[PDB]
Design a protein around this ligand. Structure first.
Ligand SMILES: [Mg+2]
Ligand SMILES: [Zn+2]
Ligand SMILES: [Zn+2]
Lengths: 69, 56, 77, 900
DNA sequence: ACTGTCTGGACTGGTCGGCGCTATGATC
DNA sequence: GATCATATTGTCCAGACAGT
């Protein structure tokens, strides 16, 4: 069957057998130690440590002015 | 010692080819069978003379 | 630190001696060029401290046989 | 004696070798004159071979159809760069000095590279890597280490144009065009000792041979000429290309001999270079392809060798074969899985060549005396010396009287003959099997139904091919290896592939269900139909109205071997309490009493003790494909011949059951009472209310984004989840209101044909139509169709069909279902090509792998891919559900054998 | 040492059946 | 009229390459 975003099925097998350097939608499985795998707060904080957040995503409105340029 | 499927097929083919152009049957025949059937009955009777060379 | 052999995906690696390498060559009747290759820049090789020309013996988890013994040859990049 | 090609050595043809191999010199750019005779010195010269039957070849004296053809040579006026080597030539031009001719490396570096070449061995990748490294190192040196002469960078222009970046006396940088003569002169200065550094053989791949001075024109046979129906000869594309090449070469020779200026000579040289480049490869990048006068581009040697229609794939890897037939297949349960229905017309055409021996002399004599028009007869007779005579009416008796030992008779296809049966596409090795010939007077092929799942073949106009082996070795190989019963278990997953399907499963359920009893006449009739060796009827289970009755389990027990005991759960399990009680009773005693088992027997738990079906109903879990446990145990524990006999007998018995008991489906199978319809409508109203509430919450802004997701796809996923829950509830209601007495429900539950969702779709609802995994959105602005308001995200406006097939869909819902079906069809039509390409790639990557006699898988080079196949040396075909040895089954079977 | 860009190659197999095309502007 | 030389030269993935 063709077609989160695990792109499983025939395209996944084709990507695996073709030794693609950058697979479509790469997904990594991350496991935590005994100090973070039993509570939600530590899991969330270590996820935010892993998560790469840029200020453009945090930005809501885009506006370029001329008075301060 | 046992015969593999490929070895058995090769032995039967060689025996049938021998029977087709000579090599009289070492056992009785039902008077009308093909040489392949003759090789099959020869194998079933355990009378085949062809051996298998195996690396060692 | 973090040992690379502690990962569940990384099988056990060992260094074969010259006598063990000769025994491996004799058992399968193959030359040193007929073994599978492993790069000298492989993290397992640099963890073992190996050099090109040696043979790495890999004890891998087998879904069908429990444990399996593979052999690789260290080669230059 | 006889010899075989041990190895093939490749290289570049030297001009001397081309001249020596040439039987003629070609100078006339023409093929035939007005009367049709070949022109001496032309491409169609008799010295290069003959195609027309009347002509006789000059070189070898043979007529058409037996002359192999002879090459010719054309002496080019000026050298022409070969395009295929052209880039490689540039590499050499970047590696050797322009004056001394040696490589641009020091002596120590040369020696070290020689040791590196000697050490590594014969792996191709290392050789290419070393060649690339040497070329990169040499191309950056502007001073020759041996002579000290300055070097200049060389720019390669596709396909055969070389530019040298030179400097004038004023320091200006300009480009000088390197003519092929200058390139060949530079290549001639390279010694043989530097050739291995450039990846060229000193005695086989001299660089000067990479520039063509003599063009080898192919033989007449390899580029044949035919006469059309209008009497006009149709020349080949290669012939036209060679005509153009010869004309341009003659013009260049005439201009050179006339003292033409340099503008003439280089222009004609470029034209000849383009012609030769197109002749080598017409699909070369950067040049216009050679076209016919009608505007059709020509395909030259490169296109003849490469491509799907090329020689390698369309003529060498795969080719058309003789003694083959192909026609439609029709079902035939009356024949065994080992047998194929061969039509009489096909049988009287395809012939098996049988040598006359001391035991089949009378049969072959009768075959010859019957003739080709009488079955069983013969078509051809080959004497021991080797002349083949076709049997007509006149010589039919004469050849029969002349028959002796050593003669060969091409007799008609007889019963018991082994033939190949293949259906395309052949995705797996089980797509072809060797069957036995069964001759019937109809026109179509006939194949047994359990063999259909291996072929992936139904009977909706399927076309199948049949191949008849000719040699005795091929027949023996087909009989032993590729026989049908030898491939019951699929090696892909280690499960049964040749198995009962559809009506077999339905008849097995009807026979083995609780309360199924048959009269004495019915039992005798099914025993005779299935071909079982039951001489005396068993004891009747019960008496009704003064007549004996036999349980269907008792009749099914006669198929199983008397020392067979296995218990499991099938797909008809919906009361686990009875199955648990049966399992517990089996667990304690390990030999439960048959009366005790029958007291609490359940159709959901199959239990066979000593070959007696004490409990359970037959379904896809019994002898179905990929699920049959009973068939899997029978194959592994009792061989393949016993398994084949059991499969044939059980298929015939189930066909008899399903034929006379009455199996049918009607419009009331999907009928539901008013309560079920009211419940479905309530579920519909609840689902639409939930969807509207979600839409309103999203509009008012209180909907919560999913982690990492914004409002739109979060709301879409919530709506799809709500619709999926509604569909599950509707399906559960439909299953609740449809009992086991329904034949469609019987087929769905037993795994014969169809699914529960299929009955749900015809009775309850069609669910939500989705495209590419999401709701339907392609259409107008803000809507899919114009019958809904723009910007509407409701269920009915996005592809959620409320009614089922029985109630009929609305035109909008019909359109949405059409979009869904079109998406599915396009998905399959796209997936098939990608799957085939991936299969071809995997096959070509793993074609040469083979298990050796020591259990190791090695490549032809010798590298040990695996020291043990599958790390345990166990065939997946013979593996037990992917395991090495089923210890549970072995222990249980041995314990039962010793206890009984 | 990275990074975007130019260039090159392949795009499941098989079968049934048909349609249609494979010269021309000077020269005596 | 019947002949005759010539007849132009769509996507996607992977490897190699100037540019910073
Ligand atoms: Mg079909
Ligand atoms: Zn010839
Ligand atoms: Zn030099």
């Amino acid at each position: 069957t063709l077609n989160i975003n695990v792109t499983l099925g025939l395209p996944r097998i084709i990507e695996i057998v073709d030794a693609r350097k950058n697979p479509s939608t790469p997904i990594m499985t991350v496991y935590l130690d005994e100090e973070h795998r039993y509570d939600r707060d530590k899991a969330l904080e270590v996820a935010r440590r892993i998560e790469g957040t840029t200020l453009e995503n945090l930005a809501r409105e885009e506006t370029i002015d001329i008075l301060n340029m | 010692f046992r015969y593999t499927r490929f070895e058995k097929a090769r032995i039967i083919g060689a025996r049938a080819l021998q029977i087709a152009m000579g090599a009289p049957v070492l056992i009785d025949v039902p008077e009308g069978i093909t040489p392949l059937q003759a090789a099959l009955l020869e194998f079933e009777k355990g009378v085949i003379p062809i051996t298998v060379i195996r690396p060692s | 630190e973090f040992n690379i052999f502690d990962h569940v995906l990384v099988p056990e690696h060992r260094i074969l001696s010259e006598e063990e390498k000769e025994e491996l060559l004799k058992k399968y009747r193959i030359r040193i060029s007929q073994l599978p290759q492993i790069k000298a820049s492989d993290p397992a090789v640099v963890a073992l401290g190996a050099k090109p020309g040696d043979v790495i013996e890999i004890k891998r988890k087998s879904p069908t046989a429990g444990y399996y013994y593979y052999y690789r040859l260290v080669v230059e990049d | 004696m006889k010899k075989v090609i041990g190895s093939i050595e490749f290289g570049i043809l030297s001009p001397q070798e081309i001249r020596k191999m040439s039987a003629a010199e070609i100078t006339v750019p023409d093929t035939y004159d007005d009367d049709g005779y070949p022109i001496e010195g032309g491409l169609m010269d008799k010295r290069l071979g003959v195609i027309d039957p009347g002509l006789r070849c000059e070189t070898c004296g043979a007529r058409a159809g037996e002359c192999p053809g002879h090459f010719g040579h054309i002496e080019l006026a000026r050298p022409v760069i070969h395009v295929g080597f052209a880039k490689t030539i540039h590499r050499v031009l970047e590696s050797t000095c322009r004056e001394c001719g040696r490589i641009k490396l020091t002596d120590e570096e040369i020696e070290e590279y020689m040791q590196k070449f000697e050490v590594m061995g014969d792996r191709k990748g290392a050789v290419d890597k070393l060649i690339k490294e040497i070329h990169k190192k040499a191309k950056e040196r502007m001073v020759c280490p041996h002579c000290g002469a300055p070097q200049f960078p060389i720019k390669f222009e596709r396909p055969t144009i070389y530019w040298e970046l030179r400097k004038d006396e004023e320091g200006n940088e300009y480009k000088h065009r390197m003519m092929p003569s200058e390139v060949r002169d530079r290549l001639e200065k390279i010694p043989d000792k530097d050739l291995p550094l450039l990846g060229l053989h000193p005695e086989k791949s001299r660089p000067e041979w990479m520039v063509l001075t003599v063009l080898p024109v192919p033989p007449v046979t390899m580029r044949p000429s035919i006469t059309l129906e209008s009497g006009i000869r149709a020349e080949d594309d290669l012939t036209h290309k060679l005509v153009d090449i010869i004309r341009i070469n003659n013009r260049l020779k005439s201009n050179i001999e006339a003292g033409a200026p340099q503008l003439i000579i280089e222009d004609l040289w470029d034209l000849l270079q383009y012609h030769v480049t197109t002749y080598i490869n017409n699909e070369t990048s950067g040049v216009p392809p050679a076209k016919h006068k009608s505007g059709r581009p020509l395909k030259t040697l490169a296109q003849r060798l490469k491509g799907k229609e090329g020689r390698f794939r369309g003529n060498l890897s795969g080719k058309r074969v003789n003694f083959s037939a192909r026609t439609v297949i029709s079902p035939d349960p009356m024949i065994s899985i080992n047998e194929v229905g061969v039509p009489l017309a096909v049988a009287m055409e395809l012939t098996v060549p049988e040598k006359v021996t001391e035991f089949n002399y009378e049969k072959l004599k009768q075959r010859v005396l019957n003739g080709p028009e009488k079955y069983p007869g013969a078509n051809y007779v080959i004497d021991p010396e080797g002349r083949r005579i076709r049997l007509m009416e006149s010589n039919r008796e004469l050849i029969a009287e002349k028959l002796d030992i050593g003669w060969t008779v091409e007799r008609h296809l007889e019963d018991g003959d082994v033939v190949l049966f293949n259906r395309q596409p052949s995705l797996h090795r089980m797509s072809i099997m060797a069957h036995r010939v069964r001759v019937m007077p109809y026109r179509t092929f006939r194949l047994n139904l359990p063999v259909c799942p291996p072929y992936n073949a139904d009977f909706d106009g399927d076309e199948m091919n049949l191949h008849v082996p000719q040699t005795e070795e091929a027949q023996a190989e087909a009989k032993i290896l590729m026989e049908v019963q030898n491939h019951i278990i699929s090696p892909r997953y280690g499960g049964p592939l040749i198995a009962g399907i559809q009506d077999h499963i339905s008849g097995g359920y009807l026979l083995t269900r609780e309360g199924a009893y048959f009269t004495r006449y019915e039992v005798e009739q099914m025993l005779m139909f299935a071909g079982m060796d039951v001489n005396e009827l068993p004891e009747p289970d019960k008496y009704e109205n003064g007549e004996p009755l036999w349980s269907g389990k008792t009749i099914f027990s006669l198929l199983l071997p008397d020392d067979l005991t296995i218990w499991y759960r099938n797909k008809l399990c919906d009361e686990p309490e009875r199955c648990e009680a049966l399992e517990k009773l089996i667990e304690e005693k390990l030999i439960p009493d048959p009366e005790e088992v029958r007291k609490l027997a359940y159709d959901g738990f199959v239990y066979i003790q000593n070959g007696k079906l004490l409990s359970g109903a037959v379904d896809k879990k019994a002898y179905g494909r990929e699920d049959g446990k009973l068939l899997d145990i029978i194959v592994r524990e009792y061989g393949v011949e016993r398994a084949r006999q059991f499969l044939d007998q059980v298929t015939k018995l189930t066909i008899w059951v399903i034929t006379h008991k009455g199996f049918t489906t009607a419009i009331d199978d999907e009928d539901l009472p008013q309560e079920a319809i009211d419940r479905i409508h309530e579920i519909i109203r609840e689902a639409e209310e939930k969807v509207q509430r979600l839409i309103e919450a999203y509009k008012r802004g209180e909907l919560e984004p999913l982690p990492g997701k914004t409002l739109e796809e979060t709301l879409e996923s919530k709506i799809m989840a709500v619709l999926a829950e509604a569909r599950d509830n509707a399906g559960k209601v439909a299953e609740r209101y449809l009992g086991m007495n329904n034949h469609a429900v019987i087929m769905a539950k037993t795994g014969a044909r169809g699914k529960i969702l299929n009955i749900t779709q015809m009775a309850a609802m069609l669910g939500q139509q989705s495209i590419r995994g999401k709701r339907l959105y392609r259409g107008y602005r803000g809507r899919v169709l114009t019958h809904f308001k723009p910007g509407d995200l409701g269920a009915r406006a996005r592809g959620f069909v409320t009614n089922s097939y029985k109630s009929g869909l609305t035109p909008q819902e019909y359109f949405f279902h059409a979009m869904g079906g079109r998406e599915g069809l396009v998905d399959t039509a796209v997936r098939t090509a990608q799957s085939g390409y991936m299969q071809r790639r995997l096959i070509n990557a793993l074609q040469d792998l083979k298990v050796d006699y020591d259990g190791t898988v090695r490549d032809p080079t010798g590298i040990i891919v695996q020291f043990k196949y599958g790390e345990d040396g166990v065939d997946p075909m013979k593996s037990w559900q992917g395991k090495t040895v089923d210890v549970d089954r072995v222990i249980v079977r041995t314990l039962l054998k010793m206890r009984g």
